[PDB]
A paper describes a structure:
Capsules are long-chain carbohydrate polymers that envelop the surfaces of many bacteria, protecting them from host immune responses. Using Actinobacillus pleuropneumoniae as an example, we demonstrate that CpsA and CpsC generate a poly(glycerol-3-phosphate) linker to connect the glycolipid with capsules containing poly(galactosylglycerol-phosphate) backbones. We reconstruct the entire capsule biosynthesis pathway in A. pleuropneumoniae serotypes 3 and 7, solve the X-ray crystal structure of the capsule polymerase CpsD, identify its tetratricopeptide repeat domain as essential for elongating poly(glycerol-3-phosphate) and show that CpsA and CpsC stimulate CpsD to produce longer polymers.
The crystal structure of Cps3D in its unliganded form was solved by molecular replacement methods to a maximum resolution of 3.0 Å. Cps3D (maltose-binding protein (MBP)-Cps3D2–1138-His6; Supplementary Figs. 1 and 8) crystallized in the P 3 2 1 space group with one molecule in the asymmetric unit, and the electron density maps allowed us to trace residues 100 to 1,145. CgoT adopts the typical GT-B fold of glycosyltransferases consisting of two Rossmann-fold domains. The CgoT and CgaT active sites are located buried between the corresponding two Rossmann-fold domains, including the essential residues for catalytic activities.
Residue numbers in the entry: 100 to 577, 588 to 1145
The structure:
């Protein structure tokens, strides 16, 4: 490329070496030979010079001079292995076979015993240079000499055959490496199908192309394309089209570009899933198995997979694994089992194609059960600590589990205790539209039916030559375990321990009689293998009680663990022998080993283990395939109404929602509330307002992003940017997002009424329009047109979405007509859709707050003539300056008067400044912010509201139920609640408030005849009139 003979300045080793290497890199070997001879004349001790001369002489086919040069280089660094190999190669090319073989032997003996030349011979170093004829010969020699059966060696042999264009030998060799493999490799299956194609065996080529795409974790369009070609050559045109259609990750005509649409990586990942969800067909002979997020293959899903394997069920099985997941022995060398990694492309496709899904915890947030899919959630044990909706530690942490139960069609239980706890503590009893059957855990079958074969294999895999008793210690995650395992050192029994992968790795096993159970052995097999079980707070004890063996509940830290996790059971009512010290554990072990007595109470077996007869897996499988209804827990579901309040900001909307919740709490219905848990967990005051809900409220929280296709992301982003109605197809595309999201959150649930109570959040307006309900209702708490043009642009999208609801309910009749005037004609909403419903009040709490809470009251209210009260925020909208000015004028005519103000705010200091101006320091008192103002509101004589803007003046009704009358400025908020019949209204000026004070002092409080129960009965009757009859379920 470059001459570099440019520097004709001679005799310089630097320039000579520069020119020589440039000649070698340009493959001008004969020309570089003379320059390296000149360098050796100058520096006759450069090891690199002898290295290059050996390379040059070998490229020049001077094999004798190559050996001489490589030898002179090797004695410059006898620890260099590449030199010794090149010595042997050039001797082999020379014909000196024996001298070369002694060289190869030195190369082998001086190599680390897992470097490739150790397990695969000297041919691996030929392969590193592309010398495939010599690599194949050495591979074949090393296989025959070692009788090796390593699949990796057969793979390297097939690679050599492939680069020699001996395709038939390459294909058959790859098939051996695959057959000899513990788990079939997707990459190997492609190399085998590729070689079979080049050999023109199309049936074998299609066979292994099919294997490759079935087991490929990542999407490979190339492999789908090659499979489709081979299927076409075979004449299978239908399957050829399917593979051709799948030769593109995205099949749909989105008419949009992914680069301009996708903002976040999660959006791209979810877009592939959503297409798979909508387009891929279910395989009626496919079963997916997942246990503990693929971290291991154990528990109930493993027992079901094992049962259906040994009974030869006609299925293909997909087992979900992670990196480094240990594989049980009975699953190796099985072509009917496909291992795919969680979260991969194959994971998403198989979640959308497997007809039968089996899990013991939960699928991730994006999983949606397709129609015709069977999802069996087995769970993973009898619960013993605080669990689910009572765990406040991460807010709404159980939400995806409650989601998964709503996605499930079948659920199994080990005992009625677990049935009650799961259905109640995950808030899904009335919503769960599937089937729950009490079959007992199939994992217990692995303990009952341990074979003498497997028992002997576990014994030799452990190192137990004698039939000494086996003691199994399996505690839960939370040093003492070191002290406890020394104290249990004994020759009388074999001690087996299983704990957390972290605990077992830093155990220091010497000085210990203990054996850490290998991770390839199931815990239920260990229960049937052992003779005595030691545990503390693990649900594995209830797998044990039906095995007629002694158990020990060793609970040294019951105080600490109960304080942290809250245990269901007291110490005296746990199973087996309850021990609090380690010396008592050893004493109890030897007592029971010698006596042979059982120590498990039969009352415990009747509570938790009455279903364990070693046949639960047949019951579960027949239940899942809808062939055995004998174990179903049939019960009556309540009808359900679903609500949305918002993010529970403490405001007028939340206070009205809480009052409505208190009024309907004993209606015999399931009141469901949908929330966004992340929007509430941030604010301490939002959580406090959320915690005031009645305890019977079923609560579901959205988890994660909404899965959307490519065009669905564009359509949504466009709508949430322009808020316009565009066409029928555009609207249907947008609404398809929210019907899918309703399914993701609720499954096949159905409700009587879906009530969007907030009326603001656009996401929840479109979502509630798609809930399967008999009636869809959305509230209006304000003048929506003023809120739209004042603060919230997205309210335009809400107005263009009122078409998707049946009723639009305002919180007052005045507000209703205002909303009709501003929205009905402008947005094509029929007048008949609009209605109103007065906000409910909690009469019992108002009455209880005023009469109870005998609290510290200022001495200046306790003694006076006429008392006037006002609660506000000093936000200028309350306008307390016009109040104190009307007071100064009203003190003239009548003087035996006092006034009190509650609250705090910005315009505070200006109030105390005005206190001295009117010289009323002893006639007006500015009390603090009171956490319970109802004692003051009852004991006062007049409640004054001088406000200029009032949104939800509910204190006005509150005071009137307490029997203390009202004077309030005639603004739109105070008139919407009072009108002309309740309370006394005045103009919004100083003179109007003085007239109201003076009119009260002559004539008294207005004789409005306000009945709090009449207002409550009217408000609730209007509410119940808005609900549905026995009408038909639908979505919009
Ligand atoms: Zn409807």
């Amino acid at each position: 490329e470059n001459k570099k003979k440019l520097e004709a300045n001679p005799n310089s080793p630097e320039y000579i070496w520069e020119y020589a290497i440039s000649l070698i890199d340009s493959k001008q070997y004969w020309l570089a030979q003379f320059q390296l001879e000149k360098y050796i004349e100058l520096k006759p001790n450069s090891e690199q010079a002898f290295h290059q001369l050996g390379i040059v002489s070998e490229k020049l086919a001077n094999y004798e001079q190559a050996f001489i040069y490589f030898q002179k280089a090797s004695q410059f660094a006898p620890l260099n292995r590449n030199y010794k190999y090149r010595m042997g190669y050039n001797l082999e090319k020379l014909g000196k076979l024996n001298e070369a073989q002694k060289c190869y032997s030195l190369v082998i003996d001086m190599s680390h015993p897992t470097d490739e030349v150790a397990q695969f011979g000297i041919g691996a170093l030929h392969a590193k240079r592309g010398l495939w004829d010599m690599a194949l010969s050495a591979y074949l020699q090393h296989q025959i000499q070692s009788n090796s059966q390593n699949p990796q060696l057969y793979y390297r042999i097939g690679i050599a055959y492939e680069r020699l264009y001996q395709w038939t030998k390459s294909a058959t060799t790859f098939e051996q490496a695959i057959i000899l493999s513990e788990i079939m490799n997707a990459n190997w299956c492609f190399k085998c199908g590729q070689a079979y194609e080049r050999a023109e065996n199309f049936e074998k080529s299609a066979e292994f192309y099919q294997e490759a795409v079935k087991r490929s974790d990542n999407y490979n369009d190339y492999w789908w394309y090659r499979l489709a070609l081979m299927l076409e050559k075979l004449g299978k045109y239908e399957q050829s089209v399917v593979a051709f259609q799948n030769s593109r990750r995205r099949k749909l005509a989105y008419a949009v570009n992914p680069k301009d649409v996708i903002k976040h990586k999660e959006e791209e990942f979810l877009s592939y899933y959503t297409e798979y969800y909508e387009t891929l067909e279910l395989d009626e002979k496919l079963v997916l198995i997942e246990s503990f997020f693929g971290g291991n293959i154990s528990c109930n899903p493993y027992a079901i997979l094992s049962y259906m394997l040994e009974n030869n069920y006609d299925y293909t099985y997909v087992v979900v694994i992670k990196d480094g997941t240990v594989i049980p022995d009975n699953l190796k060398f099985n072509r009917n089992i496909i291992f795919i990694k969680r979260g991969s492309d194959a994971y998403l496709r198989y979640l959308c194609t497997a007809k039968y899904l089996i899990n013991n915890v939960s699928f991730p947030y994006y999983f949606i059960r397709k129609e015709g899919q069977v999802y069996l959630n087995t769970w993973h044990g009898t619960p013993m600590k605080t669990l689910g909706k009572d765990i406040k530690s991460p807010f709404m942490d159980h939400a995806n589990v409650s989601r998964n139960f709503l996605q499930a069609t079948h659920i199994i239980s080990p005992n009625r205790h677990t049935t009650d706890v799961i259905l109640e503590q995950y808030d899904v009893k009335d919503l769960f539209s599937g089937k729950l059957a009490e079959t007992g855990y199939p994992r217990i079958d692995l303990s009952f039916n341990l074979t003498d074969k497997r028992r002997n294999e576990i014994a030799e895999k452990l190192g137990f030559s004698n039939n000494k008793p086996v003691v199994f210690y399996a505690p839960t995650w939370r040093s003492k375990l070191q002290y406890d395992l020394r104290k249990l050192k004994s020759n009388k029994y074999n001690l087996i321990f299983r704990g957390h992968h972290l605990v077992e790795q830093l155990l220091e096993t010497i000085n210990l009689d203990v054996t850490v159970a290998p991770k390839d052995i199931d815990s239920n097999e260990l229960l049937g293998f052992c003779d005595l079980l030691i545990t503390d707070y693990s649900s594995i004890i209830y797998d044990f009680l039906a095995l007629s063996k002694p158990a020990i509940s060793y609970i040294y830290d019951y105080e600490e663990y109960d304080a942290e996790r809250g245990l269901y059971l007291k110490p005296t009512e746990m199973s087996g022998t309850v021990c609090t010290t380690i010396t008592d554990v050893k004493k109890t072990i030897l007592e029971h080993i010698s006596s042979g007595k059982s120590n498990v109470s039969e009352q415990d077996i009747q509570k938790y283990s009455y279903l364990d007869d070693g046949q639960a897996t047949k019951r579960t499988v027949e239940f899942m395939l809808d062939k055995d209804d004998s174990c179903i827990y049939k019960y009556e579901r309540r009808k359900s109404d679903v609500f949305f309040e918002g993010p529970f900001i403490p405001n007028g909307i939340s206070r009205s929602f809480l009052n409505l919740m208190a009024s309907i709490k004993d209606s015999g219905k399931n009141i469901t509330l949908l929330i966004n848990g992340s929007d509430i967990a941030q604010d301490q005051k939002r959580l406090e307002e959320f915690n005031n809900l009645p305890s019977n409220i079923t609560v579901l929280s959205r988890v994660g992003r909404t899965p959307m296709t490519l065009e669905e992301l564009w359509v949504r982003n466009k709508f949430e940017e322009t808020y316009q109605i565009y066409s029928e197809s555009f609207t249907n595309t947008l609404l398809k997002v929210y019907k899918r999201e309703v399914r993701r959150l609720l499954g096949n649930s159905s409700f009587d009424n879906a009530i969007h109570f907030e009326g603001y959040s656009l996401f929840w307006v479109l979502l509630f329009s798609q809930i399967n309900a008999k009636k869809h209702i959305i509230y209006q708490h304000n003048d929506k047109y003023k809120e739209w043009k004042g603060r919230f642009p997205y309210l335009e999208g809400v107005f263009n979405s009122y078409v998707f609801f049946d009723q639009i309910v305002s919180v007052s009749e005045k507000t209703m007509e205002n909303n009709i005037l501003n929205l009905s004609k402008e947005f094509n909403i029929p007048e008949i859709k609009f209605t109103f419903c007065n906000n409910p009040i909690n009469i019992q709490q108002i009455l209880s707050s005023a009469e109870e809470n005998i609290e510290m009251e200022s001495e200046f209210t306790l003694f006076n003539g006429q008392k006037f009260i006002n609660i506000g925020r000093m936000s200028h909208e309350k306008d307390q300056l016009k109040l104190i000015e009307a007071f100064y004028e009203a003190k003239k005519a009548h003087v035996n008067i006092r006034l009190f103000i509650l609250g705090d705010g910005v315009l505070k200091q200006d109030l105390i400044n005005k206190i001295k101006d009117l010289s009323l320091e002893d006639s007006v008192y500015l009390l603090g912010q009171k956490k319970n103002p109802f004692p003051y509101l009852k004991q006062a004589d007049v409640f004054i509201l001088s406000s200029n803007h009032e949104g939800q003046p509910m204190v006005l009704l509150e005071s009137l139920t307490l029997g203390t009358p009202i004077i309030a400025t005639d603004i739109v908020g105070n008139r919407s609640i009072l009108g002309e019949n309740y309370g006394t209204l005045v103009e919004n000026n100083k003179d109007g408030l003085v007239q109201g004070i003076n009119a009260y002092m002559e004539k008294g409080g207005r004789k409005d005849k306000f009945d709090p129960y009449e207002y409550q009965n009217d408000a609730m009757a209007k509410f119940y009139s808005l609900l549905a009859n026995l009408e038909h379920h639908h979505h919009h």
